Amino acid sequence: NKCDVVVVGGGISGMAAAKLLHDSGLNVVVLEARDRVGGRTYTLRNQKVKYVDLGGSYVGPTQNRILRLAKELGLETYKVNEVERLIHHVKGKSYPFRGPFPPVWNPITYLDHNNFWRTMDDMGREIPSDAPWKAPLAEEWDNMTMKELLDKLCWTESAKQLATLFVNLCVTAETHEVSALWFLWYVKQCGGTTRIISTTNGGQERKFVGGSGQVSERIMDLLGDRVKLERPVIYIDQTRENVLVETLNHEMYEAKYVISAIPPTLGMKIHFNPPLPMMRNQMITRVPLGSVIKCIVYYKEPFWRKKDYCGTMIIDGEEAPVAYTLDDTKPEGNYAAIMGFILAHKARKLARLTKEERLKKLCELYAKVLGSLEALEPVHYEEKNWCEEQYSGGCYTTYFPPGILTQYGRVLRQPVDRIYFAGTETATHWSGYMEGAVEAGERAAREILHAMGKIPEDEIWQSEPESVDVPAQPITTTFLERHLPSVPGLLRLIGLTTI
Amino acid sequence: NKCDVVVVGGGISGMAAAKLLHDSGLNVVVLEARDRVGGRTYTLRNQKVKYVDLGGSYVGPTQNRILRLAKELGLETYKVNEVERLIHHVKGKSYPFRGPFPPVWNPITYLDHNNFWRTMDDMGREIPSDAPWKAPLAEEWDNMTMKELLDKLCWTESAKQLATLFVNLCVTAETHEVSALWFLWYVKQCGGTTRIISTTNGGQERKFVGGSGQVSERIMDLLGDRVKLERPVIYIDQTRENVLVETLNHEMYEAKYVISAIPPTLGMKIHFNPPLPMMRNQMITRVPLGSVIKCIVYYKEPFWRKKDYCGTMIIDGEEAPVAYTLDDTKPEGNYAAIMGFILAHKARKLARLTKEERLKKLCELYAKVLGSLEALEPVHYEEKNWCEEQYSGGCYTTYFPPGILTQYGRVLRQPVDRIYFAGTETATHWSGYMEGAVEAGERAAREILHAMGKIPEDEIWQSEPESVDVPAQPITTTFLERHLPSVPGLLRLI
Ligand SMILES: *Cc1cc2c(cc1C)nc1c(=O)[nH]c(=O)nc-1n2C[C@H](O)[C@H](O)[C@H](O)COP(=O)(O)OP(=O)(O)OC[C@H]1O[C@@H](n2cnc3c(N)ncnc32)[C@H](O)[C@@H]1O
Ligand SMILES: *Cc1cc2c(cc1C)nc1c(=O)[nH]c(=O)nc-1n2C[C@H](O)[C@H](O)[C@H](O)COP(=O)(O)OP(=O)(O)OC[C@H]1O[C@@H](n2cnc3c(N)ncnc32)[C@H](O)[C@@H]1O
Ligand SMILES: CNCc1cc(=O)oc2cc(OCc3cccc(Cl)c3)ccc12
Ligand SMILES: CNCc1cc(=O)oc2cc(OCc3cccc(Cl)c3)ccc12
């Protein structure tokens, strides 16, 4: 019943908030809808896999908050396999390569690809991380889909196809579904194109030994009976001196403040008294989550390595159920496995199939991409379609359709009386990720500490020391990358010389 | 506790469903979240206005279901005033006109405007009302916004500005917010551009004497204690023999079937056991409602009529708070008033102001457009910002952003075990309107009657005889309207 702060949601963000408040000496309760903590993270354990992350998994350089939290909890990381060659599969053929981006040989196509990535980052620099709606051309960019932007920017089909895959993979949505402003913000607030797409030196560099679910689990262990499982929140009443929070299983909690640590749209599952202000009322109906099935195929051995393939495949084309894979083999070299994502419309299309039918399609794809009959011999399979989750709404995160971020973005983390907002969606650095979950949960917690007069205003937002274990190499460009013309830039140059 | 069918929501759709089931001899309960019925319809009564519709108000020819239901309940209509001239206000000047479309005099602009409207209806002819995702170009059109389509189609700024207003007014959303496929479906399923934009012979022809709220109120009267007010549904459990429906005020209802008669996205406010199927689970997060403030300014007399203006104003441009008005004067000629809509982003922008600040802005606009100082002397004001409503989500209706209708549209009215789906959003003719509310409520009710083996499958969807009181006249076009080239067509000829 009675406490200082009720945290709604026991994912990483809610757990990080609750831990900070608990450590500060406050009495906290975490009300979690599911029979488990972790939310969009979920580590399955069984004899066949030992452990496997079926939700969020990867961490990397510049994600210093999740790294610090995990380290404090006694967790370790290991590096995702990228020793051997990556594969880009396009128009039914595989092209091995090294470095984060597939090589492009055609001079015109090269200019177009180079300009595409450069322009994404150029536009990103115009967008404040903490206020994307303040970008000089916010309205113009928000009123266009990523599809429209790619149609304008990409003078080759090659670049447009790879860019489309980029968007699908980053935000588990179609290019025509999402705002260009929001997408450009999302990439920029992860540190840019190179950082977001990279394994070595990027977001996919590492995983936690034993799974990411341990973050939320170990915090639950620290908090003991303060975490209440199978307590879906249905009602929040702020009309009286103390806030009243009611659960589906009929319990009532009373608190000074509340942290909402759930996906923004999932605030719709709560009836509010008094009603939410107009802007938040409408915002929470305008912010869907993406669509993805995470699929892990197990093999007797990591046989791809013998062919000098690391297990990374970037697979273009409608027929391919999976557009991206990574080696998911244990650091010990056993439980050989390939992780793949079925993205956006394909998650909808292929959800119709049986688990066995999806396994077959994935193996047949991998056999072709890897030129390896061994891919047709899986030993085990695990998968999770996040689209079916009542208490997530999708994965990885919330996307903004055209027009929404400028009109409603400012209220995303604006407090509503004594309700403060956590959740990765409200972060300003790696929003959408476990890192963002920690940033937002701790910031929301500190907003409450400030409201209680326990800390000064300048302590609400806090910098994070760089990890000593996972140092971040800077993102660099070459002179040629900086200065080579775009395709229309080249055509202008040609038209000028021929005059 | 125990009944045959629980209807969630006591708007027109839920009430129409409940009435049909009740009349068929089933025991029905309507669970309504608010302390009132009517939902997106709301008639306010006070001495100053007598009555005023602050929500849905207009009905017209081809909307035979709402007309039949209202007539049965003892309601009458009257005609919205369209005797005198309409006004199109463009680049700071008023241009009076007659007929449903504002005239264009420049020959290039004429071809562009003519082509715009014609093309909307041309495209609509390929979109099945009951399955827009089956349009031959469904994916191509769904993956584009209306902004993109208008950018392609409109060779003049004049046409683009008017087309933009058209979209904003029809669906209370920006052109860049909405799917082209969904918008073209929406217009087509109302009978096309002429029918949707017309007062005389169209959707805005009539209002109900005493207000549209009387539809839901009078059905509540018929059902008596079967309607439970202030019972927001929070939980639906279908794991057992009978469906269990729980309300926020702790009550439990048990039924054979449920009708969900709430806006699709408001399904999110209900916790489901077992969880919803994947497609519906995500669908209900992808379907927002539009944004609108409905504003009624009252005057001593309908002074505009003296200048041979009917009170209809179509007002282009960003600066104007209100893009469209109609005369809201009572049939008796008293309670003179102008109804105006503050649409889409302007609803968001102007919500920050006080009621008095909005009144001043509207009066000053109307004085400019009507060319009358009388507009500066209001006697009363009423308004309603539908964006603030927890149990509507907005008004008039649900819009589909790009990519959604093709991917999720088919599950809108697909039953989930023993839950059937009503609500105007699930209609196939005048979806978005009170007419669609009736169609969907009655159809959902009949799905349940069929599930119970009480009627055959071919009786689930039923035709409606034409109203004798509000007969429809045909929509016509001229030879020149049909055959004049577009701007690029004229350029190809050159
Ligand atoms: C699903 C997914 C996510 C993911 C990804 C791959 C998949 C398939 N890959 C990632 C990766 O490699 N690295 C990374 O950093 N992130 C990755 N993501 C995203 C990541 O999982 C999320 O960003 C993060 O886990 C989000 O954390 P957050 O704490 O913000 O949100 P949550 O996990 O969704 O937790 C919300 C909790 O609230 C509970 N809930 C929901 N509604 C209620 C109500 N009404 N009452 C009480 N509790 C509620 C949920 O059950 C959940 O536990
Ligand atoms: C708001 C509006 C609507 C409108 C319009 C102008 C405005 C400002 N102009 C119209 C017009 O001139 N002519 C016309 O035909 N329609 C016009 N519209 C739209 C019209 O009002 C709607 O199409 C129609 O009213 C919709 O009816 P429907 O029955 O389908 O939906 P509803 O009215 O929203 O009713 C839903 C009810 O459900 C209750 N509710 C919501 N959640 C719950 C839960 N969880 N539990 C129980 N009840 C719930 C709502 O309170 C509501 O009463
Ligand atoms: C930021 N989005 C999350 C994300 C999770 C992931 O597991 O792999 C990615 C791989 C990505 O890029 C791989 C890549 C490499 C080369 C070209 C293209 Cl298009 C994409 C981008 C994002 C991700
Ligand atoms: C479809 N939407 C509902 C609707 C309610 C209404 O009250 O007036 C309208 C007026 C409309 O059109 C008026 C009009 C006339 C001439 C040109 C343009 Cl752009 C619009 C269209 C829809 C409506």
UniProtKB/Swiss-Prot annotation, chain A:
Inhibited by deprenyl. Changing C387S: No loss of activity. One of its GO terms (cellular component) is mitochondrial envelope. Coiled coil: none annotated. Residues 1-487 are cytoplasmic. The record marks C154, C363, H380 as: Important for catalytic activity. Changing K384M: No loss of activity. GO terms for biological process: dopamine catabolic process; hydrogen peroxide biosynthetic process; substantia nigra development. It is a single-pass type IV membrane protein. Keywords: Acetylation, FAD, Flavoprotein, Membrane, Mitochondrion, Mitochondrion outer membrane, Oxidoreductase, Transmembrane, Transmembrane helix. Belongs to the flavin monoamine oxidase family. This is Amine oxidase [flavin-containing] B.
